[PDB]
Design a protein around this ligand. Structure first.
Ligand SMILES: CCCCCCCCCCCCCCCCCC(=O)OC[C@H](CO[C@@H]1O[C@H](CO[C@H]2O[C@H](CO)[C@H](O)[C@H](O)[C@H]2O)[C@H](O)[C@H](O)[C@H]1O)OC(=O)CCCCCCCCCCCCCCCCC
Ligand SMILES: CCCCCCCCCCCCCCCCCC(=O)OC[C@H](CO[C@@H]1O[C@H](CO[C@H]2O[C@H](CO)[C@H](O)[C@H](O)[C@H]2O)[C@H](O)[C@H](O)[C@H]1O)OC(=O)CCCCCCCCCCCCCCCCC
Ligand code: CLA
Ligand code: CLA
Ligand code: CLA
Ligand code: CLA
Ligand SMILES: CC(C)=CCC/C(C)=C/CC/C(C)=C/CC/C(C)=C/CC/C(C)=C/CC/C(C)=C/CC/C(C)=C/CC/C(C)=C/CC/C(C)=C/CC1=CC(=O)C(C)=C(C)C1=O
Ligand SMILES: CCCCCCCCCCCCCCCCCC(=O)OC[C@H](CO[C@@H]1O[C@H](CO)[C@H](O)[C@H](O)[C@H]1O)OC(=O)CCCCCCCCCCCCCCCCC
Ligand SMILES: CC1=C(/C=C/C(C)=C/C=C/C(C)=C/C=C/C=C(C)/C=C/C=C(C)/C=C/C2=C(C)CCCC2(C)C)C(C)(C)CCC1
Ligand SMILES: CC1=C(/C=C/C(C)=C/C=C/C(C)=C/C=C/C=C(C)/C=C/C=C(C)/C=C/C2=C(C)CCCC2(C)C)C(C)(C)CCC1
Ligand SMILES: CC1=C(/C=C/C(C)=C/C=C/C(C)=C/C=C/C=C(C)/C=C/C=C(C)/C=C/C2=C(C)CCCC2(C)C)C(C)(C)CCC1
Ligand code: OEX
Ligand SMILES: [Fe+2]
Lengths: 451, 341, 52, 75, 136, 334
């Protein structure tokens, strides 16, 4: 049991995977076995969702999160969010479930039986953590694979079937993206804009031509950055600034994956382009504009001239003006005036909502679309009671947007705590006082009196 | 030798659970208070006192089960099982809320018996009785909330019931009817409790991050002996850290640990004073100068006056259900609503 | 205009000038210590204690 | 006697393989036979409201509380 | 305590009365909460609160909707509150079941159970059904 | 010997009265900006139209408030989550009308208290300490970012952020209970166990050290003069405190390890405040607390109320009265 108890490692059982820091072969097996777990869950969860699928309900009313990712890719999906087959969703889960046995075998092979260190007999795969040239090679190899995977989405959208475009003319449907936006001022205009309202940093991508053109650039950058890190060694300013240890590299990824987790959460909450509302339900902004649209249509049929109808406060009851001047929906939903849902954009001119198009040409599909979005707002309880916190127990519903955003906001915060844990520790373990203060030469004692 | 001395020798014998003379009071009364609470939340209803389901027999979970207070009609009766309301009938005793006064009175003598236990053990171990002094905080909370607050009110009905969501009702009842957040004695209580949890976290993390290297393991828990004389952490480094981070640091370990005692106990004692005031409805309800200004100037709005409209909503929408003995029939036209809600 | 999609909020070229001039000023001080530093001097630790 | 050496001895599990399931069954039979409703006066799901009383029964008298409850629990 | 007397609901416009079987009651609550409950929770209408499912509002529709047969006729063919134009394109119905895929697998026995749940619920909860948040 | 190296040596110097460091280059300008703007806005700031309905709420002392009722009122609902700096406001009076000072204070406070956290890492590194004091401070930082930033992001408006005032805080709490049922959320329950337990363990650990102090003083002088700053010896009998608490409950339930005990003092409130910070952050996206309204049902089908239903009647009273002119439609979806 050498290296597997506290007397040889100095680590207890609860920090027991910290014994894997300097044994590269077992650390390899830990990562491919955990890779086998994520591929297992991807297979098992979407088979659960295929098995529990009913055709009468929309896919956001059934508590699903994974078949809407495949429907956005274009499988089994029809016009307007119609799910047609569920045989492509079954197949994706079988490939992911069968492949987890291969990753699960290579996990427990390299963990229990394979060589504990790769440096002696497999010099291409062996590494020291302090080898800055070898560590940029692993980073560069895995960067080219992320560029190749970003090009797979481009290949899927441009050549192999297309992706679901909720903005498509004729209704939302699967569409080949023929002209992706390659202009770097447009594409990096998402990366360098404000994160705040109206701007909405990277979440505010609003058409599929900017999505696929962004994944071309991400595919270009990751491949040219992968070849860059394979070929080169870190510059002298990089070598002065980082800690070159295994726990330090972990804490760099923990900070980066926490920033991505906060971003993917707000994708789920705000974006209705890559997360179409026919699949994920309406967004928070979308559902309250659907309410103001519903009672505008309700009261205009009763003969209200809704553009002149004064509210209780003196603002517009139905139509008011945004602080920039656009004609928006009135009420408390004036905060969500940046909402650009696909069922309300047919009524927008350059000045905001067009008044004659609201008076004359409001289509019955729009009144239906706003009606189910009003009644399936992302508001619900932990026991999945739909509605506000004062609602009674009859509706069994929580939006998938609310499940996706809350879980990944929970996870992204704790992974930022992991960045703080592991970067504080790796900085102190590199300097050599992570086990405590030396009694012989305490640093504060050899300092000036502090006053 | 003497018969008192043989019993005093047997009660203070070092065994698995120390009994002592205080265990003659604590172990009966705390067992009946805990066991009476488990009996009420599992089996006993609130259908005749409050009109509620409050046991696991009726479908409540752990959050919504309670031992509810007696009916308002019995007043401040002790509700003895042999008393003039139940008259020995155990079933009728549980239905009028007799288990509430069972749990509250045997729980009151359990807290007396537990604080006497802290005095008794400290006298035998030979230390100072500061843990019994610190337990006066929780005793002052229980006495003032569960006993003194309903005694100043109309009946035991307005006491907190012994449940999770029943306590949550008591929190919102005292906002709507008493404006208890506005009370400066609750505010001193919030400062002592959040200040106590702060002092727990800072002192816990400062010791753990100013530890001395006393072993070679990265696991630093092994490098401590319970009988060692050296300090296990650097007070000079810990004082140096907080003097430059915060400007002010502790320099005395004795004053530090007394301060960890002082802050939450003062918070429980100051909040017990204001809840004795709410027993007599001597509440911090209104700032009259803002109420007089907002009466004659109908645009003067503060977050203060917005909170009074929330309280008038609470007092009208919950009063028919929360005081069912009173037969409050409010028509929908008299219930205060905002627009569209 | 605040809801418009400007790079770093730069709507006037005054703001682009002070971003460059501010960042290049501390860069020029920092190059007073880390310019004239050899590129081929490596180390095999987790941390380097090279010079000042 | 220490604790963990008791619960790992097989004599402990000879005694408590009979006594623990017999108490778990006896707690189950306390509910299954409906005895717990009669001991504590808890309403069964049938008997929150009766045919005569469609309202929530409250006790409005202190000293005839035993007799008022007997009239509310006759049906 | 669900006797035959509470389960006795008016079945048609002439005033004849039928008893719902316990299968009609249990399945009718399940189907109503799934199909209709997002807009019709507790008997209110969320998207048009002037037109509720309480039996007084059903009494004042111009085809009087206080029956099992008249409620089933509304699900197969929905009209306005005065019955003058059809609202099948904005209400879930068998007439627009190509529009609403939730109505696509529904027998007439299922509509009988759903109409049973709308008729039985005021007999159980009188003012709570269609009463809104005042009786929550 | 260069100018930048002499500036770096002063910034990272542990001989300054307050440590500055490189996080203090972000901490000191942002927090002094937010402190200057808070004091001026709390004393003298005109009323703010918070709900976007041109009903301005007074928050400052010169407009008739006191310490309890005074607040820095959140931004306008018409602004929403839009960035509202001074230079996007066409006059300072328009910026003051629309709740501009709230966005300036909150964004400089949250930047400055994250830099306060990194400053706590930084001094521990220059002093040779173990690093993780700033991980404990991450629990109140996550709580401040939940009620000031994250809950505005999920609700889509800085108007739903917590007001910078005493009575505005209670208004924030009550509306949150009506709209999210935070009391029935288990993450607030773990937070209450974090602060009730944390102040229990503070009073417990503080009692047992004070109970077992060693004789070093007389009856005339204070007991705290038995400790000398910089002494090497232990100042209290930890065997006597363990023998007391081991007889108070039972022997196996007491820490004899002082390092394990002080770790438990750090972990219990910090994990409890971490969890309740992720309750506010997940009720930001309306994943609310437990809804047990009308869940107990008798044989006929009638609803038997519970204590959750009486709690629901108090939630109904807040929500029909909160923001009483702001709503036009029957559901508060914001
Ligand atoms: C930092 C740590 C220190 C904390 C200090 C904080 C002060 C720093 C300065 C402020 C930074 C705050 C970021 C605010 C992010 C934001 O408002 O986030 C919201 C934006 C989404 O923006 C929304 O984007 C929307 C985009 O939708 C548009 O586009 C869509 C496309 O289909 C739809 O069409 C939609 O209808 C249409 O409106 C709209 O534009 C909204 O108006 C706009 O608000 O997300 C984003 O920017 C993407 C996600 C950014 C990461 C989220 C981080 C959240 C912070 C969590 C920190 C908690 C932990 C703290 C620990 C310390
Ligand atoms: C600290 C460490 C303490 C250690 C904890 C020890 C816990 C021991 C438990 C103590 C049990 C005491 C509760 C006894 C119940 C009680 O009080 O019961 C109350 C009864 C008084 O009865 C009430 O009296 C009221 C006054 O009625 C009078 O007025 C009515 C209208 O005029 C009628 O005329 C009626 O006939 C007439 O009696 C109403 O009738 C109430 O309905 C009736 O319940 O007094 C009596 O039993 C005796 C009351 C006198 C004792 C005073 C001390 C206790 C009370 C302190 C609280 C004072 C209130 C201040 C609040 C702050
Ligand atoms: C993601 C989960 C995960 C993974 C992949 C690992 C992986 C590893 N751990 Mg870690 N560990 C984990 C979580 C994980 N751990 C957790 C949660 C804890 C706290 C309890 C620990 C505490 C811990 C300690 C204290 C130690 C490790 C050690 C190890 C390493 C060797 C294990 C070994 O040799 O013992 C042999 C293990 C067994 C004989 C158990 C057999 C279990 C098998 C794998 C189950 C397979 C079932 C599966 C269905 C089979 C599918 C087969 C099919 C695909 C063909 C290995 C790389 C050791 C180490 O670091 O060595 C240097 C070590 O000392 N772990
Ligand atoms: C990919 C991310 C990642 C990786 C590879 C590591 C790896 C490591 N961590 Mg780090 N850490 C991380 C993220 C990560 N961590 C995060 C996100 C946090 C904040 C929570 C931390 C906080 C942390 C601390 C405080 C410590 C480590 C330690 C370690 C080392 C040993 C871990 C071990 O054996 O635990 C074995 C696993 C267990 C004992 C089980 C953990 C108990 C979990 C919480 C119970 C599960 C609850 C629930 C079912 C799941 C969570 C809720 C769910 C909804 C998400 C190992 C190098 C230890 C170390 O520093 O060694 C040097 C250590 O003391 N980590
Ligand atoms: C991905 C992480 C990973 C890495 C870095 C390694 C690395 C290694 N493995 Mg391990 N292993 C893994 C996963 C991994 N393996 C998996 C998933 C399995 C189950 C199939 C195994 C089962 C396994 C066995 C049984 C053995 C090894 C051995 C080895 C060592 C020798 C390499 C070799 O055989 O020549 C190089 C190999 C090739 C050039 C052939 C490559 C063929 C593969 C299938 C191509 C993969 C396709 C594509 C790149 C990836 C598609 C999937 C992807 C999208 C996820 C080397 C250290 C040997 C060893 O440790 O000896 C003691 C050994 O006997 N591995
Ligand atoms: C998984 C993604 C990933 C990761 C972890 C890394 C990690 C690293 N990169 Mg690499 N890189 C990547 C993807 C990645 N890269 C991709 C996709 C590209 C193509 C765009 C590059 C192109 C690249 C270059 C050109 C360099 C690095 C460098 C580095 C190393 C330190 C710099 C740093 O990260 O500070 C983060 C710092 C910033 C985000 C700001 C940097 C600002 C620079 C220094 C201004 C200098 C001006 C210069 C002309 C650049 C023009 C752009 C400028 C206007 C911003 C570090 C190992 C540095 C290195 O040491 O290479 C060997 C380096 O010089 N990377
Ligand atoms: C004969 C007849 C007729 C038969 C009838 C049968 C009959 C008689 C039955 C009666 C049986 C009956 C009920 C008796 C049992 C008695 C009984 C237990 C009743 C009480 C009821 C009850 C349920 C009690 C439970 C309450 C309880 C014990 C809770 C405590 C829980 C617990 C484990 C707490 C520990 C908390 C904790 C870890 C705190 C430590 C943290 C802290 C800051 C410590 C500080 C600290 C600690 C140190 O350690 C040292 C060193 C120092 C420095 C220091 O700072
Ligand atoms: C994990 C933690 C959570 C991570 C937070 C995620 C960050 C969100 C992503 C931010 C988007 C980044 C895009 C560039 C910024 C942007 O455009 O903002 C630029 C925005 C745009 O600015 C506004 O733009 C408007 C137009 O829409 C108007 O023009 C306004 O006048 C103009 O002010 O302004 C700000 O947000 C100011 C940012 C101030 C940043 C200072 C703090 C940084 C200190 C950190 C120390 C640096 C170290 C990190 C360096 C790397
Ligand atoms: C190392 C280690 C570890 C780990 C482990 C792991 C992580 C593993 C993994 C594993 C795995 C990851 C596994 C997997 C498996 C899988 C499988 C085995 C599969 C199978 C499949 C099947 C059989 C299917 C079938 C089917 C079909 C085909 C169709 C449909 C139906 C069904 C689904 C039935 C632990 C933690 C313990 C600790 C110690 C050490
Ligand atoms: C796909 C897509 C897209 C695209 C995207 C992109 C193109 C991206 C990019 C991205 C990017 C481009 C990013 C960047 C990032 C960065 C970062 C994140 C940074 C960081 C930094 C750091 C971390 C640093 C630090 C430091 C300092 C500050 C000091 C010194 C030290 C150190 C170095 C540590 C779009 C939207 C169009 C659409 C949709 C889809
Ligand atoms: C009232 C009364 C009485 C009675 C008393 C007693 C004697 C009682 C007892 C009772 C008891 C004494 C009971 C108990 C019960 C208990 C239970 C029922 C418990 C449960 C628990 C649970 C279920 C928990 C859970 C868990 C676990 C197990 C582990 C993991 C975690 C957790 C925490 C989740 C008498 C006769 C005096 C007469 C007068 C009146
Ligand atoms: O801002 Mn503050 O509180 Ca949230 O819900 Mn809608 O918006 Mn307003 O009302 Mn309710
Ligand atoms: Fe201590």
């Amino acid at each position: 049991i050498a290296g597997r108890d506290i007397e040889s490692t100095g680590f207890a059982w609860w920090s027991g995977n910290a014994r894997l820091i300097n044994v590269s072969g077992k650390l390899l097996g830990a990562h491919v076995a955990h890779a086998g777990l994520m591929v297992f869950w991807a297979g098992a969860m979407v088979l659960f969702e295929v098995s529990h699928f009913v055709p009468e309900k929309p896919t956001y009313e059934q508590g699903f999160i994974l078949i809407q990712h495949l429907a956005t890719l274009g499988y089994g999906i029809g016009p307007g969010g119609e799910i047609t087959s569920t045989v492509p969703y079954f197949a994706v889960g079988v490939i992911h479930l069968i492949s987890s046995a291969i990753l699960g075998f290579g996990g427990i092979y390299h963990s229990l039986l394979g060589p504990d260190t790769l440096e002696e007999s497999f010099p291409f795969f062996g590494y020291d953590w302090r080898d800055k040239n070898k560590m940029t090679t692993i980073l560069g190899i895995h960067l080219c694979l992320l560029g190749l995977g970003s090009f797979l989405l481009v290949i899927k959208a441009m050549y192999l079937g297309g992706v679901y475009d909720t903005w498509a003319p004729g209704g939302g449907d699967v569409r080949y993206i023929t002209t992706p936006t390659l202009n770097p001022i447009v594409i990096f205009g998402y990366v360098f804009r404000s994160p705040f309202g109206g701007d909405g940093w990277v979440v505010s991508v609003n058409n599929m031509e900017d999505v696929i053109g962004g994944h071309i650039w991400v595919g270009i950058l990751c491949i040219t950055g992968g070849i860059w890190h394979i070929f080169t060694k870190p510059f002298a300013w990089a070598r002065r600034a980082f800690v070159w240890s295994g726990e330090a590299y972990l804490s760099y990824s923990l900070a980066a994956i926490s920033l991505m987790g906060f971003t993917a959460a707000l994708y789920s909450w705000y974006n209705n382009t890559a997360y179409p509302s026919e699949l994920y339900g309406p967004t928070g902004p979308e559902a309250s504009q659907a309410q103001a649209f519903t009672f505008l249509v309700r009261d205009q049929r009763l003969g209200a001239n809704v553009s002149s109808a004064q509210g209780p406060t003196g603002l517009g009851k139905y139509l008011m003006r945004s602080p920039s001047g656009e004609i928006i929906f009135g009420g408390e939903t004036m905060r969500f005036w940046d909402l650009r849902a696909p069922w309300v954009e047919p009524l927008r001119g350059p000045n905001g909502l067009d008044i004659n198009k609201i008076k004359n040409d409001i289509q019955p599909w729009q009144e239906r679309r706003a009606a189910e979005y009003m009644t399936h707002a992302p508001l619900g309880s932990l026991n999945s009671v739909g509605g506000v916190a004062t609602e009674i127990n009859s509706v069994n519903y929580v939006s998938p947007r609310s499940w996706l955003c809350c879980s990944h906001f929970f996870l992204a915060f704790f992974f930022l705590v992991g960045h703080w844990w592991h970067s504080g520790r790796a900085r102190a373990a590199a300097a050599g006082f992570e086990k405590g203060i030396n009694r012989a030469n305490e640093p504060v004692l050899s300092m000036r009196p502090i006053d | 030798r003497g018969l008192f001395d043989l019993v005093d020798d047997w009660l203070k014998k070092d065994r698995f659970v120390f009994v002592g003379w205080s265990g003659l009071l604590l172990f009966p009364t705390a067992y009946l208070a805990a066991g009476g609470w488990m009996t009420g939340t599992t089996f006993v209803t609130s259908w005749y006192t409050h009109g509620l389901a409050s046991s696991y027999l009726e479908g409540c979970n752990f959050l919504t089960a309670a031992v509810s207070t007696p009916a308002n009609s019995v007043g401040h009766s002790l509700l003895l099982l042999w008393g003039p309301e139940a008259q020995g009938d155990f079933t009728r005793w549980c239905q009028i809320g007799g288990l509430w006064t069972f749990v509250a009175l045997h729980g009151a003598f359990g807290l007396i018996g537990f604080c006497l236990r802290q005095f008794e053990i400290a006298r035998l171990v030979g230390i100072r009785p500061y843990n019994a002094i610190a337990f006066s905080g929780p005793i002052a909370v229980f006495v003032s909330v569960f006993l003194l607050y309903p005694l100043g009110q109309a009946s035991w009905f307005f006491a907190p019931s012994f449940g999770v969501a029943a306590i949550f009702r008591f929190l919102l009842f005292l906002q709507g009817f008493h404006n208890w957040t506005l009370n400066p004695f609750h505010m001193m209580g919030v400062a002592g409790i959040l200040g106590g949890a702060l002092l727990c976290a800072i002192h816990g993390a400062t010791v753990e991050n100013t530890l001395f290297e006393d072993g070679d393991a990265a696991n630093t828990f092994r490098a401590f002996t319970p009988t060692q004389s050296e300090e296990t952490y650097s007070m000079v480094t810990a004082n140096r850290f907080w003097s430059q981070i915060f400007g002010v640091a502790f320099s005395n370990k004795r004053w530090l640990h007394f301060f960890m005692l002082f802050v939450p106990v003062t918070g429980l004692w100051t909040s017990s004073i204001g809840i004795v005031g709410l027993a007599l409805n001597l509440r911090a309800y209104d700032f009259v100068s803002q109420e007089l200004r907002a009466a004659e100037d109908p645009e003067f709005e503060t977050f203060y006056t917005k909170n009074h409209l929330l309280d008038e909503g609470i007092r009208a929408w919950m009063a028919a259900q929360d005081q069912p003995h009173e037969n409050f029939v409010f028509p929908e036209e008299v219930l205060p609503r905002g627009n569209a809600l | 205009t605040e809801g418009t999609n400007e790079w770093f909020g730069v709507d006037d070229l005054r703001l682009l000038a002070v971003l460059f001039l501010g960042h290049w000023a501390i860069l020029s001080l920092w190059l007073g210590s880390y310019g004239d530093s050899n590129e081929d001097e490596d180390f095999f630790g987790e941390i380097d204690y090279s010079a000042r | 006697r220490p604790f963990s050496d008791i619960i790992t001895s097989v004599r402990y599990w000879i005694i408590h393989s009979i006594t623990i399931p017999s108490l778990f069954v006896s707690g189950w039979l306390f509910i299954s036979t409906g005895l717990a409703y009669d001991v504590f006066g808890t309403p069964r799901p049938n008997e929150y409201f009766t045919q005569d009383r469609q309202q929530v029964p409250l006790v409005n008298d202190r000293f005839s509380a035993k007799q008022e409850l007997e009239d509310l629990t006759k049906g | 305590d669900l006797d035959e007397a509470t389960r006795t609901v008016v079945v048609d416009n002439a005033g004849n009365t039928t008893v719902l079987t316990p299968e009609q009651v249990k399945r009718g609550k399940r189907l109503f909460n799934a199909t209709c409950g997002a807009c019709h929770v507790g008997g209110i209408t969320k998207t048009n609160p002037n037109v509720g499912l309480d039996p007084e509002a059903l009494s004042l529709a111009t085809p009087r909707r206080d029956n099992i047969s008249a409620l089933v006729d509304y699900i197969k063919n929905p009209t306005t509150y005065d019955g003058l134009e059809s609202i099948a394109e904005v209400h879930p119905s068998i007439k627009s079941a190509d529009i609403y895929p939730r109505m696509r697998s529904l027998t007439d026995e299922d509509l009988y159970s759903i109409a049973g749940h709308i008729m039985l619920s005021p007999k159980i909860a009188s003012e709570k059904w269609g009463g809104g948040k005042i009786y929550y | 010997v260069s100018l930048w190296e002499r500036f770096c040596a002063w910034i990272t110097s542990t001989e300054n009265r307050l440590y500055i460091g490189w996080f203090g280059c972000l901490m000191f300008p942002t927090l002094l900006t937010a402190t200057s703007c808070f004091i001026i806005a709390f004393i003298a700031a005109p009323p703010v139209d918070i709900d976007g309905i041109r009903e301005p709420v007074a928050g400052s002392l010169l407009y008739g408030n006191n310490i309890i009722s005074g607040a820095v009122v959140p931004s306008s609902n018409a602004i929403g989550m839009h960035f509202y700096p001074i230079w996007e406001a066409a006059s300072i009076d328009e910026w003051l009308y629309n709740g501009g000072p709230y966005q300036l204070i909150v964004l400089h406070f949250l930047l400055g208290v994250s830099a306060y956290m990194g400053r706590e890492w930084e001094l521990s590194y220059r002093l040779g300490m173990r690093p993780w004091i700033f991980v404990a401070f991450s629990a109140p930082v996550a709580a401040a970012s939940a009620v000031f930033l994250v809950y505005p992001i999920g609700q889509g408006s800085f108007s739903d952020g917590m007001p910078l005032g005493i009575s505005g805080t209670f208004n924030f709490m009550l509306v949150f209970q009506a709209e999210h049922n935070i009391l029935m959320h288990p993450f607030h329950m773990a937070g209450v166990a974090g602060v009730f337990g944390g102040s229990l363990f503070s009073a417990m650990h503080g009692s047992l050290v004070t109970s077992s102090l060693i004789r070093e003083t007389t009856e005339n002088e204070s007991t705290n003069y038995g400790y000398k700053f910089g002494q090497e010896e232990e100042t209290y009998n930890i065997v006597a405190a363990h023998g007391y608490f081991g007889r108070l409950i039972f022997q196996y339930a007491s820490f004899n390890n002082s390092r394990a005990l002080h770790f438990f003092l750090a972990l219990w409130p910090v994990v409890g405040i971490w969890i309740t910070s992720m309750g506010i952050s997940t009720m930001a996206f309306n994943l609310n607390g437990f809804n047990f309204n009308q869940s107990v049902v008798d044989s006929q089908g009638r609803v038997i109320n519970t204590w959750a239903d009486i709690l629901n009647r108090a939630n109904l009273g807040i929500e029909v009265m909160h923001e009483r002119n702001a709503h036009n439609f029957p559901l508060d979806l914001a």
